[PDB]
Amino acid sequence: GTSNRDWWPNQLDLSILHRHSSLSDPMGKDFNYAQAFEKLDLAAVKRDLHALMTTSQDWWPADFGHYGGLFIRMAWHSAGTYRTADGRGGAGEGQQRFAPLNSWPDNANLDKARRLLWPIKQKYGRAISWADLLILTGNVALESMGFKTFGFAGGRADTWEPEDVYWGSEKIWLELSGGPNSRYSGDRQLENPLAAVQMGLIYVNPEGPDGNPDPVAAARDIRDTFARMAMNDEETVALIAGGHTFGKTHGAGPASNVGAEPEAAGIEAQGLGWKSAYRTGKGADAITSGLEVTWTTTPTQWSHNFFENLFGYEWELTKSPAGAHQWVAKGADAVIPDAFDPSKKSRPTMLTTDLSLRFDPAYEKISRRFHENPEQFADAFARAWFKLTHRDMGPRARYLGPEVPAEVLLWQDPIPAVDHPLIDAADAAELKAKVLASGLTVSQLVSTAWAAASTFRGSDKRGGANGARIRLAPQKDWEANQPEQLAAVLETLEAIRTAFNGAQRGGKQVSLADLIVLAGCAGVEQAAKNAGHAVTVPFAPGRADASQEQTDVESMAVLEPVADGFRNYLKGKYRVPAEVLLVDKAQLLTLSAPEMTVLLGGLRVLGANVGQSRHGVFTAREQALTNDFFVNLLDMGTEWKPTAADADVFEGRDRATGELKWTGTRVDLVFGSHSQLRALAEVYGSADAQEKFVRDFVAVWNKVMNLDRFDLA
Amino acid sequence: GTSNRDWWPNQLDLSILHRHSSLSDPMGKDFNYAQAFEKLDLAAVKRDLHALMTTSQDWWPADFGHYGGLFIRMAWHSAGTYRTADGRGGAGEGQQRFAPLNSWPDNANLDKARRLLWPIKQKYGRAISWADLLILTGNVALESMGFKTFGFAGGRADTWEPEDVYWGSEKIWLELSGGPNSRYSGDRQLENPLAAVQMGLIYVNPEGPDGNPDPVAAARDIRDTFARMAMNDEETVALIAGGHTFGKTHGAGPASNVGAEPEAAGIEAQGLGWKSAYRTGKGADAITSGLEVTWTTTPTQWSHNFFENLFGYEWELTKSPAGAHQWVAKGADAVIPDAFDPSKKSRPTMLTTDLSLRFDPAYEKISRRFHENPEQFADAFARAWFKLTHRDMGPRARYLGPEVPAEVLLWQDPIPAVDHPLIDAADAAELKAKVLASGLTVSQLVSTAWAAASTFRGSDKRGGANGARIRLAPQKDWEANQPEQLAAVLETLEAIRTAFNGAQRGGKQVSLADLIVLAGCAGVEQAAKNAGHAVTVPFAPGRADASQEQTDVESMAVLEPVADGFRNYLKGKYRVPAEVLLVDKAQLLTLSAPEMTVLLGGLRVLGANVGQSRHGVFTAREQALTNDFFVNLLDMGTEWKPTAADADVFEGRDRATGELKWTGTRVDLVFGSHSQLRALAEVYGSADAQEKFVRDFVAVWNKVMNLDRFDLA
């Protein structure tokens, strides 16, 4: 059936903002997964998982009698989709079980891994999510094989449909670079926000870049994609060499034997795929990647044999039984055990990308250090595996259960504990009055709190106003944050703060994080007053102030808004139209279309635009909270045309007189163009809507202010 | 951005069932449009709309100084998308304002018509929906031009996104038939459920079939598409001649002048389209369809001049200024006024399709009657216009406001008023106990009530258990309803009914509609009992029993379930896969994916299958309400293969022994295959799920039982 997408493939898609409704969710609207999990007997789950490790099923027999390797790969692929650019992907939503990730080529036969866990999932039911279970199974596999983990946190709630993520534009699985939808240009520059070299791969190609088996050039791709997953060189070497301490690859025959991936398979395959016509199709005969490598002499036990082999042999380029490039140790004895035949052994083998750890000069130094100092290796890999599998979980307040590590890590963007009484309602009213008496404007107050709060993204739950990181590097210098104006607001709030705190008894004090947000509430209340309305804006104290030392400047860089339609800001030219960038930002903020609508209409009349631009300021009473934006946008007495100078700025003129009334951007005008957005603007631009507009605005404002407040969850 | 639909274009689409969530609705969750509308000053709206008719706006000047014809066309197109095969389309949701209908070529310049309404929509806000307003505006246009309408009901609540409708498979607007995606086959047989000849047309081509200007052959396409919109020959002639009493068509120059439709237009167009480069692009120079016909000597006043002209002249083929085929009376004087120049007149003209009303033999008899007796014409047209514009509104209980016609029309599937006291909670318990003591089985009870209630479709709100039409023709003979079995159940319930009613004092009695539902509730309660659980199934009395005289048998035919996955029933072979037909039935029932899941898994183990098929009956305790369907479907100990005899029936065998355990259809096994549905099945198949399964079953059961109960709204 022909769809709207077919007729108008370039129209904006809003259904990303209405994903994950109560309609698709089988659990009741008050189901709280954290509460369910906190009562789970996690020790009992771990016992079952230990028992599963050596309980081989005949439809997918365990290599070496132990599913540990398979489960470690499973959990690493669960986490391995993460991109620091947008926070999307990662293990935190258990998206490995839905399309498209369940059917990516690099996830081949992880459908079998997930099926092996159904009896445990079924036993514990709602008290352990798939998302948590995948990770927990990875940890138990490590532990079962003699590797002490750093810890584990539960709390990843299950999801019920695919996440809308941009995974690239290629229309061919695994397409090599330089095609019509190439993700590479220039000197092998991978397009943001992508973090994989080919469509359907986790990070890199194990044969080498575009299949060329050059470990030096493969190292460049490893370093770039791991960095785009938040990992440095030390973590990268620890993760790859730690993971390939275990298990094996699967390439026993030609890949042509493997049939349809799970989304393409017949109904009778009951959710599984990649059924293989090669011999038994499984076990000794398994084909997954097409490579046939077993790294160590004890593939079901933690050892130091990875780096012994990597350094201890010279390597020769060979081909697996499926035809894939791989390496074999020159002159070695047959020391590597077979997965199924006790009487067979083979020579040590490596992937191209394992050799990168020796032949890239920076990796080589780290690899050598880990070879000479195996305790450092073990500790780095323990830390890196915890980071891998928790990087998208957000603040530590979300972490549940008895195995959470007490050590606070830099990457968690930590927020100090609050150890003093919080301001009360009377103190808040006092501080708001101070703020409004300082001479700070509506615009200033609203802009600052928006700047502080709107860094949040729900994809990985980073950002938000807690921590008062707007006063630190790098946020204080972001162009969207108007650094000179920002500094003058923070100076004035800091003096208010110091005066208030210096007057208190007991240990009562307000943080700057809380004051920034309360000040913005005061600005919204003053704006309402300016429009003739009595409005109280909710405020929840309890934020604390992070230090510079608790704020990794390079990791914060990915939170910078280079496009923020809510401040009519675009830092440069993008190929994606500005209204598409708006919808993307609304999605990261967790807003619906109605919420995005109301929020933007309000912010325009409150003076939140960067640079005091007039674009979209469709009111004669700036800094008053009204629905003027909508009423004026929708006035058919105004005719709109793109300007001569810039086709993304428009002038609105009186259709009768030709007089200039307004200017606007695409972000502004899209609310008068797009037929779903226009229908929302009409609600808010009606004669009976001023109250509804104010109430709805205050609600979304408060929502944004509280995005990161998982301490109150 | 490559999507899942790109990689797997034939996978089942569930997002149809999660449309219209609370996420996308700008109105609060307690907004009740009926309550809003009941306090609208309807008379005031109609005054504003009357004034509008003659208040020309320079961006779309009114023909003849009067927008009445434009508004008539607007409201006819709003209603004219309706199809009786599925109930989809129609004016009841205001979908003309969304894609794709806002941009259909037959909807050209209706965007201007909707924009002329915004000031009124704005004035009255949420108290009149767009959906009601479009229709009301057509009524006021009629009335302002001297035509007495039959009535008007409000209550069509607005929607906030496009409806998912199959409008055809063609990939080119207006594609002539016989293409690669032809909607015709055989001897010009149009595919169900479509009701238009070309993609983007309301019903037929005004030039004739695929542009052949033969009025005789055009009449066959009129008859077929009107019939697919539930109109007979009398109603069709009345509607066409009545609508073409007014206004004109627009074809002043070549169609190449006309630019992008609204969804393709630039952002500066602010939701309008079809901008024309022909001269002024509007008014005297307007181009819409490309035809240039003005039917009567008084295009702004009700008259009988359509038929005077049609019969009074002999007609000759000519071409409009855009090159379209049309007809002119060459022997006539210049008697037809120009729309903008008071000094110009022209000859009478007609469309091909207008001439069908004289040259088709069955039409000609009716047109002749209406010519000779224009009072009969006026009355047929008023009745047909009311039917046209209310056909999708559902039961009369939904009709709001002061202009509802008191006459009860057979097409409305009327339900008699209830004039007696209703049974109370103790009476319901007594009746449940009597039903269960009769010997009627859980399976009988469940199946009967499912059969009675599951005719409902939310597309046009027809069907459901109110009326007890399951005892009447044609429902009592539908093969899905198991007519011999059903008759035995209805006999037993009827005797229970007569006994209970004969024992009452003071007028209290129960309807058979209510008893059929209540007996079903007893069956569900007994099934829960059989599983070891005491539950009470909610029941709301107040249904009444319709007679055979109040039931149009021919109109009921479209409600026959020919595919009902909930009873594992397919009346024949279809090219559409059975699981697709399940999701389509779930959508018509207003079910979300979780509701569909729970409901189907319960009905399987209750014995609701047609013919007591064992397909999907994955339980050893049939007639007990358990989660067995899910537990057994998901058991990896069972392996599934298509049968040799039928590739859509599957055998489930023990993986170890080969012992035959179960059989299923695609409808059953989709729940173990599809990655979203299987995630749902897992919830209800988990060890902690027995309570949740029974509670969710009872809720969805009760939902289905109450679908048509707009008397309790």
Ligand code: HEM
């Ligand atoms: C440069 C990055 C990486 C590359 C290119 C890569 C490549 C692969 C390939 C091709 C396989 C074989 C799949 C099969 O045929 O069954 C595999 C297996 C595996 N990888 Fe990696 N790997 C990477 C990083 C990781 C990381 C970070 C971890 C975990 C910390 C990991 C742990 C595993 C383990 C445990 C297996 C064995 C699976 C089994 O025993 O069934 N690898 N790797």
Ligand code: HEM
């Ligand atoms: C066989 C069915 C019909 C055909 C093929 C048809 C065709 C058309 C065409 C091609 C136009 C010209 C559009 C334009 O160029 O502006 C139009 C105009 C119109 N039609 Fe129909 N029509 C049909 C049935 C109806 C019915 C059922 C009604 C209402 C009861 C209706 C009422 C009107 C009115 C009022 C106009 C004039 C619009 C104006 O004044 O701007 N028609 N018709």
Ligand code: NA
């Ligand atoms: Na994420």
Ligand code: NA
């Ligand atoms: Na409908």
